[PDB]
Amino acid sequence: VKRTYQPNKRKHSKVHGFRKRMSTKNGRKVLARRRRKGRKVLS
Amino acid sequence: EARDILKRPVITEKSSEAMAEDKYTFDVDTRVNKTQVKMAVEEIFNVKVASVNIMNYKPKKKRMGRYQGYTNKRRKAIVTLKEGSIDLF
Amino acid sequence: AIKKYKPITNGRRNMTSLDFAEITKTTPEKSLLKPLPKKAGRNNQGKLTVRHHGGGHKRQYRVIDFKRNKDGINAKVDSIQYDPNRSANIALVVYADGEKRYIIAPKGLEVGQIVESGAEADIKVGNALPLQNIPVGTVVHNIELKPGKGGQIARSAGASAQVLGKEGKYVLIRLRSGEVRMILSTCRATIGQVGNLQHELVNVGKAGRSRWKGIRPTVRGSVMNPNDHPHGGGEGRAPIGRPSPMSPWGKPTLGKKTRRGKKSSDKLIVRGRK
RNA sequence: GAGUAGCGAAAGACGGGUGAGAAUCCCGUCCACCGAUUGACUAAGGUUUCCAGAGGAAGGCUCGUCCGCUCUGGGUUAGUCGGGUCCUAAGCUGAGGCCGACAGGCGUAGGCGAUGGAUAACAGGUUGAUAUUCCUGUACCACCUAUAAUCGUUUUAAUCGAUGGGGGGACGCAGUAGGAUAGGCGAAGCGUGCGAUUGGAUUCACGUCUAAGCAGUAAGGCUGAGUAUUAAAUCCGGUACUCGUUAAGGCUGAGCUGUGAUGGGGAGAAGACAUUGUGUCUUCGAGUCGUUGAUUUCACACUGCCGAGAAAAGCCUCUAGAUAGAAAAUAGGUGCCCGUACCGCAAACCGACACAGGUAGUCAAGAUGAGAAUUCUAAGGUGAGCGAGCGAACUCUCGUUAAGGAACUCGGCAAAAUGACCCCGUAACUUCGGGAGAAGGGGUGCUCUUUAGGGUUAACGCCCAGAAGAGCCGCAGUGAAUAGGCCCAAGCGACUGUUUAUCAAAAACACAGGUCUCUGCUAAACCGUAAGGUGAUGUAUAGGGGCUGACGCCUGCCCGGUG
RNA sequence: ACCCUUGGUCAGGUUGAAGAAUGGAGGACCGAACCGACUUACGUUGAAAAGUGAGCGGAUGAACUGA
Ligand SMILES: [Mg+2]
Asked: Domain range holding C267?
């Protein structure tokens, strides 16, 4: 059966990805929290 | 410049077979173009190159012990000079 | 005229279509055609605002001059054509010295008749002239509301208003509905009724033929759930259990007059209808 | 719980070898499975799983000397392929601007963005791994330099041209035709075999070649485009004459070739040596005829239809301007970044797994047929990561059953039976379309005689079909596989369609058709606080909402109450 | 789920509308690919957190599918 997450590099990097989070202030937030947390993969 | 881009030569059974012909193989920097490699080699060895071909190799996974790593990204150029002979002694 | 299909299939029993005899050229012009990308009820946000609108056959827009502004220069009708955007047809016209543009096809425009826009133009089916020079009693189409903006009133297959009189700077006009409005005299009309008078007699037949003009099914309100519509709910089929039939968004729908009061057009409507 | 359940669709057997160890690894023979695919490509996705050595702890539902596992070392080569480079759609952004408690939302000019448009390389060889990328052969597209065979006020030219104008690109659905073309299938050439089971000796394979460059062109489209005339144009957007609708063929379109390149790379090759332990190297080798032929290509061509079927750039002319210059008949050079391994109906992807699910597109042979159905097979892959016994109960899947035939059962659930093609027949009822394959009957094998037919034709010959007789054989002749059970009568819904992904597919929803009502256009209705939109670039034969729901006959009475 | 832009797919046969032959209409018919989930049986610590087998419905359209 068709399950979820039919992977796609372009959409993955479009809906997510550094420049997309840097396009909205709320996007800028999640990077802020992820650095405060010391995350290694930020977007 | 013209010496900083040729990192090392490449010696291996396939490179050796190419050297049976006038094709020589080098490990060049990752931010250069064919023309610059032509110029650099014909500047150093005083050779006259006819053509050159470039390829980019992706970083390969290498696990050392318990720590995983990746090897460095590589850019390899193949020259096919006409007259001349890059000697790798 | 109307062609009645023979009942060869059930889904095609009572079907009827337009014979398309009046159409003389079956192809458009590359220079008076611009793109129309269907929007399907969606707005600047992307949300369905009007419903029952969706997929349909592509269509090219045929830009026409409702503002018949080339004055004095005569024009020949080259071909009466089919237009998908409108109930009526359109007619290519070539002006006496080279330019060509589309108009709306009157009732009896035949390829070869000349058309003159202006103010010293005759009273002939097709010629456009201001309402100060249109005799009392004439059938008029494409009636402009503001001087110069272009035709806005009476433009659909079989639309005709009658110039009924003259006040001062306004002429009295009985629009298709029944309203006797007052339109400024410096505004233009076009003599005659708009063609495809049999557009209203066609039968669609197929569900799919209605689902080719861009219509989508409309769900009778009395079967949605209480959270979807005011007529919804009930165990079984139910009557309208409210004092009045209602609308999806909670507003009376069988009688409530929804015309904004205090409008700047109220001083211009002598009698109303519809 | 227990040494219990499970070991994840399937055909293996045996000889040889390897090792401490072998049903399980390597080689060989035989056998079997797929073959509109388990075959070949190519996308998306995964990233090194790719290749050669080596290892055996762990992972492989068993074992393991093996591997998609581990260790070591390797492997992806482009001016022409796909992108960047060129263009733009839907959308997304958006300087100034509009609106906004802040945050910010919207939006113009302009940009970004292919799933589309435009763009110059073909064949063969080649390793363990790459190849329209490397090499051999032959090309083509841009760009630059030298030279030019005289183009010639450098305004015009050999000819340079916008960011502007126009043309072009440039497009739907469905039918048939038609010409050759890849295929496939029979016989001339070529090849190598002529048999140890009775017999026979006109008794299996091959059968070729590109882009480019011209020479030709097969359906196929258009001429008045005719001189002169109306921030501008004297090629085009609108006018008026002679030869006039010639096809002379003027024009623009566009799966096509004899003597040459063709006594040449490849020449399905047995022929050839010291060997490339004989596994190899020279160098030597046929391409013919005539049948069928596309779902491919002309080509959205033509014809018909209504549902009326992208944009921009490349490109072409034309001006505005710009300028003493190179075109011409050559000869030399220069052409960058990214992707390229590997899997891709799959043990490398989405499903936690070496999962019986899902995963767009291209090619797709023979016999039988109408067929991409069905059974067997070719090219090519594969034998399914547990087995050896015994053939108890009981479940599962499958076949057959005496006599009876729904007596079972809530219900003929399941199973059984009809099925193909040809001929003959077919009722009520009908909205005249249908009902209808209605129902219901009969035949189909094989050999011979005979002899119509039309298709390619110069004819032989090759195809594809007919009719009438005379036999022959079986229990059975569409001898296997594949291919409707039917009829009478009631509700319900007109119908095709859509619905509770994962217990309900229906009488529920849609529907075409009716009716009522609102709405005059900054329309009503709707999304937003607003700006901006949708409606609509629509205009009462239009748009929103309510109700009912093909079609036919009709739709009574009540306005007290509420709206 | 719906929609916007741009692409792709639908072997083969039948019937014979409008305009005796001709013509090629249809949410027309039979039927593969494809899509669906009607009945049943199996499965129910599954091969599978919805499938498989056998039948079954659409199959040029209100079709199906890709980006
Ligand atoms: Mg699919």
From this structure: 195-274
